[PDB]
Write a structure and sequence with these properties.
The PDB classes it as immune system. Two copies of one chain form a homodimer. With 241 residues, chain A is an alpha+beta fold. Chain A is 19% helix and 37% strand. The first copy, chain A, has one domain. Chain A has five helices and 13 strands. The radius of gyration of chain A is 20 Å and the shape is globular.
Chain lengths: 241, 241
């Protein structure tokens, strides 16, 4: 489930060829990785900034963080349509493979690999209506010290903020989410509601698991590093992941 | 040159589909990114572990760092043969594009993109003969406090070490390097000495620059994080970049 979703996510990212893309961690968290949402990077307390930071969802958006409002309207358009499954092999010993084996109650009966097949259908791109206006607000606004995330970020040096600016999602019939503020898009001829991932034991075709990826689910996203300066002003920069 | 090499590197990495791969920064540094070489990650003093670390070549290898020797023999084999050029577009405003424009003395005469074409020929994979034996030595050996890199790493918390374990290189007729300790490989039917990258002004086909990538040049590599514990013992872990 959560590992088989990661298979879908990794497959899309490997096919897209964009280095900046980050994977969405689970289906349940999808809504937290839409444009204008805020993510946090916290570097593990054990490691001395010698490990990649851990990226964590938050419930906040940019407007929860700015002293003055800012345009929150988003748009979505079709990005790619996969007409064939994305096929890979996962070794049972890898992190993903052990996670998958957890779902097989009696084990995989000696299988050393899982054959994974991800049918993604139509994937769409969500983004702000006018990224220029949002960047302009970042130049002009200040951070609300009232905000608890803002306070914690300004007092701690190990909390770093990220601003999601673009998200690749599996298609939906209408609005991708109800919580975010979407322009009314179009009813294009696309594949909706058929995204599915399967994993099969290498040594038993009848030993498989399968998850549906619900319409609208975010698969991957790109974000900008968001710095809060000591005078509460802001600055965004392009990240790499 | 250095930007057009980065075009080659990024093209290979985008084609390979391995998330762990890191790009070699320049042709001149290639030898420092072969298996068993040591890299350093230093996080910028300005950023509070909120930026990706900067990866830096060093002149050291694992045996410069261990108290006891360790097998240093490497092997190489053919990985992929590109039969067609890898074609992309670089915007003149991007970091890579401005770097490329520096090489055009009078400017690009208003061109907003560069058409880049990377002919990589046969790319080979360099790796240790027996990674198991090297990991075993990492489990058993200690770090030489005599070593200046070792001392600096143990006293500072912002210096992190990396151990290169696999390198993708453009093919060579014989040994990829003279400095490293290679087994004698094979004289396979491969394309050697034809790797070239070109960039052309979008608005003038007669305005171009071109670099040759010398046989044996490392393009990308994967590394393990190498930790020195307070008791001078060691530990490696898989990285992601």
């Amino acid at each position: 489930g959560r590992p088989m979703f990661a298979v879908a996510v990794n497959e899309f990212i490997r096919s897209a060829g964009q280095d900046s893309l980050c994977g969405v961690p689970d289906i349940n968290s999808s809504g937290d990785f839409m444009p204008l949402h805020i993510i946090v990077k916290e570097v593990p307390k054990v490691l001395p900034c010698c490990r990649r930071p851990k990226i964590k969802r938050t419930p906040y958006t940019l407007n929860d963080i700015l002293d003055e409002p800012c345009p929150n309207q988003l748009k979505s358009s079709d990005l790619v349509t996969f007409t064939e499954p994305l096929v890979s092999n996962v070794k049972a010993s890898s992190s993903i493979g052990l996670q998958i084996l957890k779902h097989f109650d009696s084990g995989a009966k000696g299988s050393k690999n899982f054959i994974t097949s991800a049918s993604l259908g139509t994937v769409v791109k969500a983004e702000t209506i006018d990224i220029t206006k949002v960047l302009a607000k970042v130049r002009t606004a200040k951070a609300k010290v009232e905000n608890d995330l803002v306070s914690r970020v300004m007092k701690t040096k190990r909390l770093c903020l990220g601003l999601v600016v673009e998200t690749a999602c599996v298609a939906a019939a209408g609005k991708l989410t109800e919580a975010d503020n979407w322009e009314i898009s179009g009813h294009t001829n696309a594949n909706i509601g058929e995204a599915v991932v399967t994993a099969t034991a290498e040594l038993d075709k009848n030993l498989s698991r399968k998850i549906e990826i619900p319409p609208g689910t975010a698969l991957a996203y790109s974000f900008m590093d968001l710095e809060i300066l000591e005078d509460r002003s802001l600055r965004v920069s392009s990240s790499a992941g």
